[PDB]
Amino acid sequence: MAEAMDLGKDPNGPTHSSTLFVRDDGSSMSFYVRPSPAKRRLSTLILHGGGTVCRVQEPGAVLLAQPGEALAEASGDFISTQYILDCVERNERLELEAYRLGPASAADTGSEAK
């Protein structure tokens, strides 16, 4: 008789995942940060989570803006920067749609693909 048990180990490091910004398909999403002093703080978190940050508005990139007020500094459709901390805090890529700040005129054709 014989038995073989393979085992690893639990993360002894911090609660910040390296695949936090990575989707199930392995697809790393691109998040566009609005030019601001908060950009550096967001970008370092995004890349650390395994996500890609956009300096300019890329086709299909998520628009990010800081809250700052009860409404938003958003010129159009923008996501709250809070998502950065919330996603990692939950250790799961959370519904981005729930972090939308400012509303926008939803058009039938207003996206981009490559």
UniProtKB/Swiss-Prot annotation:
Q: Which residues carry this modification: N-acetylalanine?
A: 2
Q: In which tissues is it expressed?
A: Ubiquitous. Highly expressed.
Q: Position(s) of the covalent cross-link Glycyl lysine isopeptide (Lys-Gly) (interchain with G-Cter in SUMO2)?
A: 114
Modification Phosphoserine occurs at: 36, 43
Q: Where is the protein localized?
A: Nucleus; Cytoplasm; Chromosome; Chromosome, Telomere
Q: Which residues form the BRCT domain?
A: 78-101
Can you tell me which family this protein belongs to? Belongs to the RAP1 family.
The record's function comment reads: Acts both as a regulator of telomere function and as a transcription regulator. Involved in the regulation of telomere length and protection as a component of the shelterin complex (telosome). In contrast to other components of the shelterin complex, it is dispensible for telomere capping and does not participate in the protection of telomeres against non-homologous end-joining (NHEJ)-mediated repair. Instead, it is required to negatively regulate telomere recombination and is essential for repressing homology-directed repair (HDR), which can affect telomere length.
> What is the annotated quaternary arrangement, including any partners?
Associates with the I-kappa-B-kinase (IKK) core complex, composed of CHUK, IKBKB and IKBKG. Homodimer. Component of the shelterin complex (telosome) composed of TERF1, TERF2, TINF2, TERF2IP ACD and POT1. Interacts with TERF2; the interaction is direct. Does not interact with TERF1. Interacts with SLX4/BTBD12.
Further remarks about this protein from its record: Shares a bidirectional promoter with KARS1.
What is this protein's record name? Telomeric repeat-binding factor 2-interacting protein 1
What portion of the full-length protein is represented by this chain?
1 to 114 of 399
